Amino acid sequence: KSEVAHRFKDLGEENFKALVLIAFAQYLQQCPFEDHVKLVNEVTEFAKTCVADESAENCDKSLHTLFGDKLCTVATLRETYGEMADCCAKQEPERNECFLQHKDDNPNLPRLVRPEVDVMCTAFHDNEETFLKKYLYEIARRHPYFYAPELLFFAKRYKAAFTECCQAADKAACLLPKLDELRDEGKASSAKQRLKCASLQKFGERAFKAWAVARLSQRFPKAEFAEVSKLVTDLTKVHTECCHGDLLECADDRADLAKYICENQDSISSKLKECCEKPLLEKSHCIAEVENDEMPADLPSLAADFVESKDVCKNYAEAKDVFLGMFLYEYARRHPDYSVVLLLRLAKTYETTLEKCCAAADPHECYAKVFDEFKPLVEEPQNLIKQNCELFEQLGEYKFQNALLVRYTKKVPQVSTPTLVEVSRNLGKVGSKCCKHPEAKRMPCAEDYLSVVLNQLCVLHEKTPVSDRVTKCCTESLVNRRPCFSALEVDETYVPKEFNAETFTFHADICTLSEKERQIKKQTALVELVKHKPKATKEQLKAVMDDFAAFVEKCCKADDKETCFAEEGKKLVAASQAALG
Numbered sequence: 001k002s003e004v005a006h007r008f009k010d011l012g013e014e015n016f017k018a019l020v021l022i023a024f025a026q027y028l029q030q031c032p033f034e035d036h037v038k039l040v041n042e043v044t045e046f047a048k049t050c051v052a053d054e055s056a057e058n059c060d061k062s063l064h065t066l067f068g069d070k071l072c073t074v075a076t077l078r079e080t081y082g083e084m085a086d087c088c089a090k091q092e093p094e095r096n097e098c099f100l101q102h103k104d105d106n107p108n109l110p111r112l113v114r115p116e117v118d119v120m121c122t123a124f125h126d127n128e129e130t131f132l133k134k135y136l137y138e139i140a141r142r143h144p145y146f147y148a149p150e151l152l153f154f155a156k157r158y159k160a161a162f163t164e165c166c167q168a169a170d171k172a173a174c175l176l177p178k179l180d181e182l183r184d185e186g187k188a189s190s191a192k193q194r195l196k197c198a199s200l201q202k203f204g205e206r207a208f209k210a211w212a213v214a215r216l217s218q219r220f221p222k223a224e225f226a227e228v229s230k231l232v233t234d235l236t237k238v239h240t241e242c243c244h245g246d247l248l249e250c251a252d253d254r255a256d257l258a259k260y261i262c263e264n265q266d267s268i269s270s271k272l273k274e275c276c277e278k279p280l281l282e283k284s285h286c287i288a289e290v291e292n293d294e295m296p297a298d299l300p301s302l303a304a305d306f307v308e309s310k311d312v313c314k315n316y317a318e319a320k321d322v323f324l325g326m327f328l329y330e331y332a333r334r335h336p337d338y339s340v341v342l343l344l345r346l347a348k349t350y351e352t353t354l355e356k357c358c359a360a361a362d363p364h365e366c367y368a369k370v371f372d373e374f375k376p377l378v379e380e381p382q383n384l385i386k387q388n389c390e391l392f393e394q395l396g397e398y399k400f401q402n403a404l405l406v407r408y409t410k411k412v413p414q415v416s417t418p419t420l421v422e423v424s425r426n427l428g429k430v431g432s433k434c435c436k437h438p439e440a441k442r443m444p445c446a447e448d449y450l451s452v453v454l455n456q457l458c459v460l461h462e463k464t465p466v467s468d469r470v471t472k473c474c475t476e477s478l479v480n481r482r483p484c485f486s487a488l489e490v491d492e493t494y495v496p497k498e499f500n501a502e503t504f505t506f507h508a509d510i511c512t513l514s515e516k517e518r519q520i521k522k523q524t525a526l527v528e529l530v531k532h533k534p535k536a537t538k539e540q541l542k543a544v545m546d547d548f549a550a551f552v553e554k555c556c557k558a559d560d561k562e563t564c565f566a567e568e569g570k571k572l573v574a575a576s577q578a579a580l581g
């Protein structure tokens with residue numbers, strides 16, 4: 001057997017060459033692109049020898065062996081990576097483990113600049129393969145733990161955006177939003193992978209299994225508990241392995257679970273047919289994104305099994321996690337309109353009540369009201385969504401963002417201005433996205449996107465802590481994270497930042513910036529204004545922002561923009577200072 005031949009045949013040459021590029025860029029993060037292209041060509045040539053004849057020299061070696069051997073042939077391995085060259089002195093599997101240990105998650109490479117649209121469209125046009133591959137390389141070496149097939153899926157979407165937009169009348173008006181959306185989707189995917197892994201370390205496999213029970217049950221509600229339970233057990237093993245970070249082992253684990261699911265469609269879901277006709281590379285991806293199946297009609301209420309039955313405490317006590325899993329399965333499959341975390345809150349509530357009540361002489365009487373305890377937990381996120389979507393509709397995206405900016409600056413004014421801006425804007429984007437869903441779809445959508453916004457915040461904060469309240473929210477159970485953040489109040493102890501005239505000076509270019517860059521400059525100033533006058537009322541802030549808008553309208557219409565911005569700017573600042581007192 002030749003695993004390399006098998007992979008080449010299953011993936012196809014184009015996918016194989018792209019995944020080899022990613023694999024090498026993620027380990028050899030400092031080698032130039034042209035060196036990688038040469039590694040990829042040599043691996044591909046060799047793979048083709050194996051495709052032609054699985055008995056040919058070296059074709060029977062394992063992928064790990066061949067990949068390691070290839071890394072160890074890199075002439076500059078010691079000069080560039082130091083310790084990582086010491087990996088070559090090991091045999092397998094120690095060698096591969098040593099390579100994994102020496103990938104660098106923060107590699108100190110310059111930020112990837114978005115060039116001008118015409119520059120990008122010209123290069124895309126002039127050498128499409130090089131254009132796309134080089135950026136694949138740039139991103140992969142900066143995100144060495146990003147799962148390589150997912151990276152490849154994104155690359156195909158980028159390729160599609162350039163293909164469409166570079167042939168359009170207004171290239172920029174077509175392309176830039178598509179790049180913005182793909183940037184966000186990429187970061188959401190990246191953050192979800194990090195979430196799952198840190199969660200698995202920080203909270204244990206039990207927590208992750210509860211999450212999976214809830215999510216799979218919503219997705220595959222016609223599946224029986226034992227089937228959901230098997231998928232949960234395998235999914236946990238898969239995520240366990242993928243977090244260890246060996247791409248091949250992770251891929252085999254994912255492909256095995258995808259094969260299982262596809263051979264078992266009739267006992268899992270009616271929505272999988274399309275996914276299960278895809279080639280191996282895309283199958284597991286497609287399954288992970290499948291829409292929820294329709295739930296069975298005429299499912300009974302949970303009262304009989306979970307409250308009224310004389311056997312609740314007996315069934316619970318004999319196998320606690322199994323019985324709670326059943327509860328979560330039954331609740332989730334009936335509620336695809338709930339967030340996963342909401343379902344976990346309800347399961348945790350159910351658990352807390354059984355633990356208390358099953359020790360009493362009359363358990364039945366003590367847990368008789370447990371379903372009533374669920375009502376306020378469900379209503380809290382439904383009501384927050386309703387209120388936020390109504391506010392979003394009244395204000396529009398930009399002013400909604402500004403309302404959040406003001407409120408979150410007052411809550412946690414120690415956070416850096418850029419972070420407050422980025423978070424507030426992203427929360428507004430969650431509003432945009434999720435408020436276009438009907439009520440039924442709103443809570444899962446908000447959970448997913450908020451999870452990435454709050455994670456991006458928590459990552460920043462953990463690297464540069466500024467607030468004990470934020471620390472607490474970021475380090476609590478991920479279940480309680482969003483309610484802990486919702487419980488934040490205005491900071492009563494904060495000392496106003498001292499006035500700085502430069503902070504509130506604006507220049508003529510603001511008139512001609514993109515809407516996004518103009519917005520970010522205004523939002524920055526708004527945060528600074530709140531940090532300076534954290535007790536300003538909504539009326540007072542609105543008066544200042546209205547003057548600002550008048551000021552920008554007047555100076556952007558003026559002939560001599562530099563002097564208007566300077567002179568009208570000084571008048572604005574002085575007036576505003578006297579208003580806010």
Ligand SMILES: CCCCCCCCCCCCCC(=O)O
Nearest residue numbers: 339381384385388427431447482
């Ligand atoms: C503030 C921007 C988001 C727009 C929608 C409001 C979000 C409300 C939180 C919904 C609950 C998410 C999941 C949960 O914690 O149960």
Ligand SMILES: CCCCCCCCCCCCCC(=O)O
Nearest residue numbers: 504522525526545548573576577
């Ligand atoms: C201390 C007073 C100096 C502040 C002067 C005016 C500050 C401008 C407010 C920030 C931008 C408003 C946002 C907007 O309306 O788009």
Ligand SMILES: O=C(O)[C@]12C[C@H]3C[C@H](C[C@H](C3)C1)C2
Nearest residue numbers: 014015018132133155156159
């Ligand atoms: O494997 C593939 O087909 C490819 C490999 C690269 C270049 C181009 C666009 C993306 C990324 C998918 C083709």
Ligand SMILES: O=C(O)[C@]12C[C@H]3C[C@H](C[C@H](C3)C1)C2
Nearest residue numbers: 112113114115135179180183
């Ligand atoms: O700015 C962005 O979002 C990016 C930055 C680089 C890499 C990739 C494709 C292009 C160029 C746009 C993402």
